[PDB]
Amino acid sequence: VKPMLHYFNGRGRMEPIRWLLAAAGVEFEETFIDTPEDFEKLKNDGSLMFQQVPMVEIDGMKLVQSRAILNYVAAKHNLYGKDIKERALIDMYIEGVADLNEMILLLPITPPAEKDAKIMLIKDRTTNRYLPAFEKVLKSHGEDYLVGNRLSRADIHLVELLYLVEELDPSLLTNFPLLKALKARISNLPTVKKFLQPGGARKPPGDEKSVEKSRKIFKF
Amino acid sequence: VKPMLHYFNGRGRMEPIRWLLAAAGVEFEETFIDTPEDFEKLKNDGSLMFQQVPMVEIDGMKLVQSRAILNYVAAKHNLYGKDIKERALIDMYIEGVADLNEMILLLPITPPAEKDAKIMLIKDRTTNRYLPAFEKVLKSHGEDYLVGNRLSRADIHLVELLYLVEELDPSLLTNFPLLKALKARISNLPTVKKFLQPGGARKPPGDEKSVEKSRKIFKF
Numbered sequence: 045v046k047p048m049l050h051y052f053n054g055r056g057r058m059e060p061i062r063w064l065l066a067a068a069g070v071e072f073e074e075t076f077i078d079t080p081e082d083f084e085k086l087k088n089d090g091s092l093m094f095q096q097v098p099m100v101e102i103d104g105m106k107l108v109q110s111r112a113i114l115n116y117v118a119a120k121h122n123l124y125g126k127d128i129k130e131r132a133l134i135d136m137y138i139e140g141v142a143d144l145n146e147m148i149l150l151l152p153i154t155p156p157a158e159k160d161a162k163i164m165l166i167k168d169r170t171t172n173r174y175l176p177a178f179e180k181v182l183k184s185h186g187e188d189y190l191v192g193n194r195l196s197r198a199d200i201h202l203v204e205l206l207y208l209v210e211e212l213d214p215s216l217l218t219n220f221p222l223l224k225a226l227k228a229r230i231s232n233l234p235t236v237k238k239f240l241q242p243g244g245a246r247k248p249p250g251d252e253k254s255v256e257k258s259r260k261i262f263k264f
Numbered sequence: 265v266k267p268m269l270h271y272f273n274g275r276g277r278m279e280p281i282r283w284l285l286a287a288a289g290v291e292f293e294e295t296f297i298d299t300p301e302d303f304e305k306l307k308n309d310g311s312l313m314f315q316q317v318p319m320v321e322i323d324g325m326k327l328v329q330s331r332a333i334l335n336y337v338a339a340k341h342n343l344y345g346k347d348i349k350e351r352a353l354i355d356m357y358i359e360g361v362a363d364l365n366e367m368i369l370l371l372p373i374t375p376p377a378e379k380d381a382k383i384m385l386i387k388d389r390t391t392n393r394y395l396p397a398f399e400k401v402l403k404s405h406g407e408d409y410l411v412g413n414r415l416s417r418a419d420i421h422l423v424e425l426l427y428l429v430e431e432l433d434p435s436l437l438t439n440f441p442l443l444k445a446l447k448a449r450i451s452n453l454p455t456v457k458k459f460l461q462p463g464g465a466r467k468p469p470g471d472e473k474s475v476e477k478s479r480k481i482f483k484f
């Protein structure tokens with residue numbers, strides 16, 4: 045049976061699960077939360093351990109917590125390294141990805157006065173902290189993948205973040221040629237290609253009106 | 265060689281690593297960051313992949329990212345379940361612990377005007393979302409541990425959080441007898457007992473002046 049993904053019809057916290065399942069070549073289905081009552085239904089079903097989504101029905105579980113879902117998917121589909129040493133590298137890399145992702149994820153709901161400052165900070169962190177660190181990993185071993193010379197969730201999560209960075213400002217990737225190269229190679233894996241092409245499961249960026257709709261469903 | 269823990273002499277993001285290593289019966293050492301120049305030294309050493317701590321030297325790695333360090337320690341010392349299904353439950357539980365932890369962790373640096381509202385929200389989440397959810401897990405199987413009828417990092421991380429809740433307001437545990445019972449059993453494991461007794465590695469709560477010291481070292 046295909047996993048079932050419960051979320052708003054948008055990127056938010058479910059987008060990295062879509063990318064990772066897609067990258068693993070796993071067909072999945074989505075039940076969109078379009079109304080407050082769609083959300084209320086999942087809570088009243090007892091489906092949500094913490095009264096929150098993402099939730100993914102997979103292998104007889106109703107998994108909540110984005111990290112728990114990703115860890116399970118990655119381990120099941122051999123995208124979490126070969127040994128605990130490789131996992132330690134993967135985990136360290138993707139937790140960095142997670143921190144920069146979280147800043148970008150919450151930009152839309154930043155108090156309007158400090159939004160410019162927040163964009164400056166994200167660009168500063170992007171160019172001076174995160175991308176330098178990942179560029180140095182690729183520089184150090186000259187291999188096609190971040191870890192174990194093999195495709196892992198680290199490649200998928202980083203490449204998903206490079207697309208977001210490019211959407212924020214394409215000049216931010218200018219000084220990171222090895223990361224641009226990763227992005228091009230990962231984008232051309234058969235499974236990721238289908239995911240990114242027209243009609244794939246990838247979600248578009250939100251607008252003023254998708255933000256307003258999500259805010260009256262989730263309260264933020 | 266004993267692991268080496270690099271952090272401020274305080275709880276912050278390193279406290280759950282201290283608990284987990286202690287619970288696994290692993291002797292460790294700590295190099296405290298007492299001054300801006302202590303921090304600057306780690307950055308200039310190239311020790312910090314993202315220019316941040318926690319950092320833990322263990323088994324020839326300089327691991328940063330609290331989750332990467334915990335995932336490694338838990339897997340090494342057989343505290344991460346027997347299979348990926350048990351890890352999915354463990355992960356789902358501890359990610360909920362992590363969300364309530366994060367609210368408590370940032371209380372000290374909440375603007376003093378909205379601190380009361382923040383404490384109200386934390387108590388609401390504690391009594392109406394998190395503790396109910398963990399109480400239901402123990403109720404459902406009536407076993408001594410949250411997962412696999414066996415000690416896991418889920419027990420250690422939850423019992424750490426129950427101590428923090430008790431520090432915030434002891435009446436918050438009143439309606440959660442099975443969680444009080446877990447806290448009492450876990451607190452009496454030989455390794456955790458030493459960790460909690462006088463002269464153990466457990467750190468005290470911060471004060472106005474430990475918060476001020478950490479703020480001018482880490483800029484937060």
Ligand SMILES: N[C@@H](CCC(=O)N[C@@H](CS)C(=O)NCC(=O)O)C(=O)O
Nearest residue numbers: 057095096097098109110111262363
């Ligand atoms: N730590 C959780 C965060 C989940 C979360 O914040 N969920 C939101 C939607 S993205 C929600 O359900 N909000 C409603 C609420 O907290 O009541 C995860 O990563 O899964």
Ligand SMILES: N[C@@H](CCC(=O)N[C@@H](CS)C(=O)NCC(=O)O)C(=O)O
Nearest residue numbers: 143277315316317318329330331482
């Ligand atoms: N996601 C990281 C957070 C690390 C973090 O925020 N580190 C702080 C100290 S707890 C720091 O080094 N701050 C200085 C800075 O970011 O420049 C983790 O969980 O380890």
